[PDB]
Amino acid sequence: DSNNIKYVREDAKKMHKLWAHIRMAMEGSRAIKDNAKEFVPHPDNTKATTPEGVARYKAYIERAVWYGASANTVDGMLGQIFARDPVFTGPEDKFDMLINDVDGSGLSIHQQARDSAEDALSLGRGGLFVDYSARPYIKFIAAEDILNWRERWVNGAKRTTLLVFREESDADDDGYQIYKEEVWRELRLVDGTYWQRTWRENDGQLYVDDWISPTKADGSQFDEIPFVIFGSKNNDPTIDMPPMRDLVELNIAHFRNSADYEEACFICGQPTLFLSGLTEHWVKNVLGGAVVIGSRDAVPLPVNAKPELLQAEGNGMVKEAMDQKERQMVALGAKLIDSDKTQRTFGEASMEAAAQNSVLSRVSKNVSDAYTKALRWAAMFLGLDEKIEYELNSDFDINKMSPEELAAVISAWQSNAISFTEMRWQIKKGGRAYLEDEDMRNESEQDDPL
Amino acid sequence: DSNNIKYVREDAKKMHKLWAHIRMAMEGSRAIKDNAKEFVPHPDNTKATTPEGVARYKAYIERAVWYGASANTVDGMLGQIFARDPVFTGPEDKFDMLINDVDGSGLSIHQQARDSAEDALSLGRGGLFVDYSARPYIKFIAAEDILNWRERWVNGAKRTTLLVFREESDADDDGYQIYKEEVWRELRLVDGTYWQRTWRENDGQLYVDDWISPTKADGSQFDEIPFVIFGSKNNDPTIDMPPMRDLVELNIAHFRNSADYEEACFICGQPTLFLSGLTEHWVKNVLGGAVVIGSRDAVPLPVNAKPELLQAEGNGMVKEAMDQKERQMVALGAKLIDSDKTQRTFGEASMEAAAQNSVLSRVSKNVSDAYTKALRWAAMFLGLDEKIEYELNSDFDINKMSPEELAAVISAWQSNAISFTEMRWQIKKGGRAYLEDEDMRNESEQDDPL
Amino acid sequence: ALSDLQVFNDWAYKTMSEVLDQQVELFNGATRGAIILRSAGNTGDLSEAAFWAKIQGLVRPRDPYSNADVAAKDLRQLVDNTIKVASGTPPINIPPSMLRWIQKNPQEAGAVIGQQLAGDTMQDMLNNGLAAGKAAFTAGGAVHDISAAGTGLMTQRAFNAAQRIFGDRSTDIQVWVSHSSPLFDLYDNALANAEQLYVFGTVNVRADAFGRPIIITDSPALVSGAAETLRHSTLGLTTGAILIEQNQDFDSTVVDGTGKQNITRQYQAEWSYNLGVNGYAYDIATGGKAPNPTALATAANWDKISTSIKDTGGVVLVTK
Amino acid sequence: QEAGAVIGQQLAGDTMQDMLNNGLAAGKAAFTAGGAVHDISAAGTGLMTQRAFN
């Protein structure tokens, strides 16, 4: 019951380093350059000990350019997933407060879903908490916030019996300074009953609270802890592999190769005369320690003197490795960057569309399940309808819908094959309508001007 | 008392530098060349301290060329988002005062929306403030103007308790000198009630005004602070990562590589005779320091003498570095440049359009939600209808509607499958209509001329 | 026990750390409330509570014929006490560069330090509580010694002496906590019964023949000496006898000190809790503001607050 | 974090103070260097008066 509430499950401690790495890779070039020691080894650590070595390493890191493939990958994946908006199924008037302001901050449920999908795509872990205030609130939980979970078997079933997670909040003191006050919720399930504590630590003063048992509208307590841990793979308490690991590693390798290439650019990319076969007498007498290199003047040289404009040549091995890493990130990614040079045949990509959009569909289904479960839990708080759904947009590759597509869908609705709400969802998905279905009905009931 | 109204959060202070550099990158070549000291490191610090070194560095920077594709990026993104005009749904004649002059300065809500969208696309921050004069005014708070905020849970909900922003102005005197006097607004929320103060600063003092509780037309004061902060990620007080980071860093790298390449062009670009196997006596005899190099005149050389023009040859490795960086800038998805030589096979652009347009859709949704919320708050101030909406253009890649597209839309309106206002909306998006639909109905109700 | 050598999901994937060898599950219900483990913070380095005292001459004989002179009486107010104990962690040298074993695991270092530290922290709480309880009971005169009589440990005749000491209220003693050697001596004596009150089916009784189960832990605080001078301490506890109360102020930092040829990465932890013994007060002046186990286990640092031994909860028995 | 907050507020105050003081000192030094100085300490009794402002 009472123990070290700050304890972190040791495999979460395993995953902290990787999770921080994806966070840094998403943050951008500045974050990577700030901790470049963890990514780009010094070409000579014995130099790195010396102050000249650390200055050289600083200059070496600054000249490098971060490609930013992982951030673009996550952005494009999120954009593809959230074409238009997820649709709500069931009563829409009764659930309006959960939709418009899900957490009470005015942040709509679709935006919270966007954050959850971003987390599940980037570092592949998140959580939803639904608790009573009178109005239920659907929290959002970061991956590093879920810090403990266990599983005994009661009647031989998978039942998460313990779940502790941290919360961050700024104390509302009189002044204008910013603290960081921590709150822990200890969700405990005993003999099929939900229990929870609050560990508010305002002013470091432990206002630990007695165990409480939340009740539904009709009572009967609860049978399951209302906390779904959505992930890249599935809604399991076990940690799932982040989808961005390979892309982040490729980006780091390309960044190192870029550092080498930029150092080469700055040093040996400039042509130089390299006056060979030359004597000090000749220099000090005719050159005078100064060479005019414009086309107006000519320069003399003694017998058997050969000048040689030396400069590093292109298509080197370093840039070849950089090109292959770029192609590899293109190859194992999904709509992360675009190559205007190459062309792709229509119909060839139609067959590979399903394979290319695997992670998108998986995360879409996972988050849809998680949010539907949370909505059902909130309904049971309110004693509302249970058969409700919240599905994220699963039909990917969305564009303006063709005129023949419009004719086909209208013909299909004219037959008893597609419902009116289905047809409106189709026509809105194609960017052909904006008014709600009921409003369109109300306007279209009236007689036409003719 | 604290009296620290001007205090800025630590993370906002961290983001000031990135915001300023993004502003500089958008600004153009002048701002970068004024501060090329940071972006372009001196090729030699030992010379950099010396005077001839700083002269060489100035001549080095002046020949550099700021490619400036970040500005073109943001311009193209804004043009795609703000094409035609965002649609306002609700009683217009009650809200005509807001649509016409959104802040009492004659600017339509569309122009302020465009400014907010540009600020969200550029550095991922903004703020809309609504206050009571009788008329409500929708402010526009610059990204750097929001200098403090606070997030505290009451009744288990995300509620914003403190939010301080700077309001700039110019002093009104009879003279012609322009002062720049600032007033700080402290938006505070205590026990679910919105209060407000203004801090003024003149003649060596810091004014404080009385706490006020702005009320709706129906009274009942307020429950939420009428301030919304939007960005690329979502409408949260926490900073959203600016979308231009990758483009800004790549543009800076391209700028310094262009500096190096232009130095090479100036110095080693022009050919030189480089007469080898040459004696001083021959020069002083016939050359005399002057070699006529026209096609009319021929010049001799001694035995075993070799002339050889030497200029830097093309496709240098520095040029290929600039080329790869430009291709990267294209690859990150920015609509920054076009390419006349590239040819794309249609049927594949729509495959990834949803991914190329990801941040555009995200910003569209965020700004639409923010302006919707601001309009609802203004309606609450006036005590008018609450079911009002404000949505931006969510369908990019707009173009003239094809005759087949027009026929399909018209046939869709013939059936009770798309509303008349929807048909008018699409036909206007296709640029096939300009006048208001009510004027259309008034004109077309009359009998045909025959 | 568990081996998990068959499948290696990850290198030394939590497979073993020999986390602890002593039974430390002796808190709250485990000790039947005797050693209650709680989580409620309090400030400073103490926790003082005041309660009224028993008036010694409350009832007096009265002579109706001559009331004589009224004896003057007055009422006091005793003071409770709860010292705060500070416990840390020696700097732990994490290997920053992964050391290239058959199991290559750099961050598993901190991952396993977490669990080992949790186990050792609970062990330290239990051991300090037991040592402080022994010291307080010894200072209060609640001790018995049977070392000089016979083998030095009787099967059940030993417990009756503690019952006699604690007096008429002996019913409220629930649990004896003891080292494993007294339990094995108990088994050996029971396994060869002089008065045959044991049968083969009932020779493995863990209780004390009065409904007070013996709870076994190998706490070093309950043993002292070696060979001939080896002594085992068994102490009985009522409900709420030992109060170990955490403050939930765990602090943990990892520092990249370096300073040498190779990088130096360290680990450090800090926490605190409040130790209290029912009916006794820690003498703050005699001991220290942040006492160590040596000072906690030392008598004359504990004062008897309750008027009667029956009020305070705990009796200690020494067996050789 | 209370220590960090206290340091932050005191640091804001002291940073304002330090920039103000250094600006005023540099201004006084520059005005003395440029020869735009008027002294009342020598002229009779050196006290603030509207005459000194004139």
CSV table of N, CA, C and O in Angstrom, one decimal, chain D residues 19-38:
chain,number,residue,atom,x,y,z
D,19,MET,N,22.1,46.4,-14.8
D,19,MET,CA,22.1,47.1,-16.1
D,19,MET,C,21.8,48.6,-15.9
D,19,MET,O,22.4,49.4,-16.6
D,20,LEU,N,20.8,48.9,-15.1
D,20,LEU,CA,20.5,50.3,-14.8
D,20,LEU,C,21.7,51.1,-14.3
D,20,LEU,O,22.1,52.2,-14.8
D,21,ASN,N,22.4,50.5,-13.3
D,21,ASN,CA,23.5,51.2,-12.7
D,21,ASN,C,24.7,51.4,-13.6
D,21,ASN,O,25.3,52.4,-13.7
D,22,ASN,N,25.0,50.3,-14.4
D,22,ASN,CA,26.1,50.4,-15.3
D,22,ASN,C,25.8,51.4,-16.5
D,22,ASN,O,26.6,52.2,-16.9
D,23,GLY,N,24.5,51.4,-16.9
D,23,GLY,CA,24.1,52.4,-17.9
D,23,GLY,C,24.3,53.8,-17.4
D,23,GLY,O,24.8,54.7,-18.1
D,24,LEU,N,23.8,54.1,-16.2
D,24,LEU,CA,24.0,55.4,-15.6
D,24,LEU,C,25.4,55.8,-15.4
D,24,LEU,O,25.8,57.0,-15.7
D,25,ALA,N,26.2,54.9,-14.9
D,25,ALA,CA,27.6,55.2,-14.7
D,25,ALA,C,28.3,55.5,-16.0
D,25,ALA,O,29.1,56.5,-16.1
D,26,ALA,N,28.1,54.7,-17.1
D,26,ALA,CA,28.7,55.0,-18.4
D,26,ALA,C,28.2,56.3,-19.0
D,26,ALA,O,29.0,57.0,-19.6
D,27,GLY,N,26.9,56.6,-18.8
D,27,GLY,CA,26.4,57.9,-19.3
D,27,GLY,C,27.1,59.1,-18.6
D,27,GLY,O,27.5,60.0,-19.3
D,28,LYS,N,27.3,59.0,-17.3
D,28,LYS,CA,27.9,60.1,-16.5
D,28,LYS,C,29.4,60.2,-17.0
D,28,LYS,O,29.9,61.3,-17.2
D,29,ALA,N,30.1,59.1,-17.2
D,29,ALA,CA,31.5,59.1,-17.6
D,29,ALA,C,31.6,59.7,-19.0
D,29,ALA,O,32.5,60.6,-19.3
D,30,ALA,N,30.7,59.3,-19.9
D,30,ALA,CA,30.7,59.9,-21.3
D,30,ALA,C,30.4,61.3,-21.3
D,30,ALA,O,31.1,62.1,-22.0
D,31,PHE,N,29.5,61.8,-20.5
D,31,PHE,CA,29.1,63.2,-20.5
D,31,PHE,C,30.2,64.0,-19.9
D,31,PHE,O,30.5,65.2,-20.3
D,32,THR,N,30.9,63.5,-18.9
D,32,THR,CA,32.1,64.2,-18.4
D,32,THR,C,33.2,64.2,-19.4
D,32,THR,O,33.9,65.3,-19.6
D,33,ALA,N,33.4,63.2,-20.2
D,33,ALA,CA,34.4,63.1,-21.2
D,33,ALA,C,34.1,64.2,-22.3
D,33,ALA,O,35.0,64.8,-22.8
D,34,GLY,N,32.8,64.3,-22.7
D,34,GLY,CA,32.5,65.2,-23.7
D,34,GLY,C,32.4,66.7,-23.4
D,34,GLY,O,32.2,67.5,-24.2
D,35,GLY,N,32.6,67.0,-22.1
D,35,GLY,CA,32.6,68.4,-21.7
D,35,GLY,C,31.3,69.0,-21.4
D,35,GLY,O,31.2,70.2,-21.3
D,36,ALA,N,30.2,68.2,-21.3
D,36,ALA,CA,28.9,68.7,-21.0
D,36,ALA,C,28.6,68.5,-19.5
D,36,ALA,O,27.8,67.6,-19.1
D,37,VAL,N,29.3,69.3,-18.7
D,37,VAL,CA,29.2,69.2,-17.2
D,37,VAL,C,29.0,70.6,-16.7
D,37,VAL,O,29.6,71.6,-17.2
D,38,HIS,N,28.1,70.7,-15.7
D,38,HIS,CA,27.9,71.9,-15.0
D,38,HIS,C,28.0,71.6,-13.5
D,38,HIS,O,27.3,70.7,-13.0
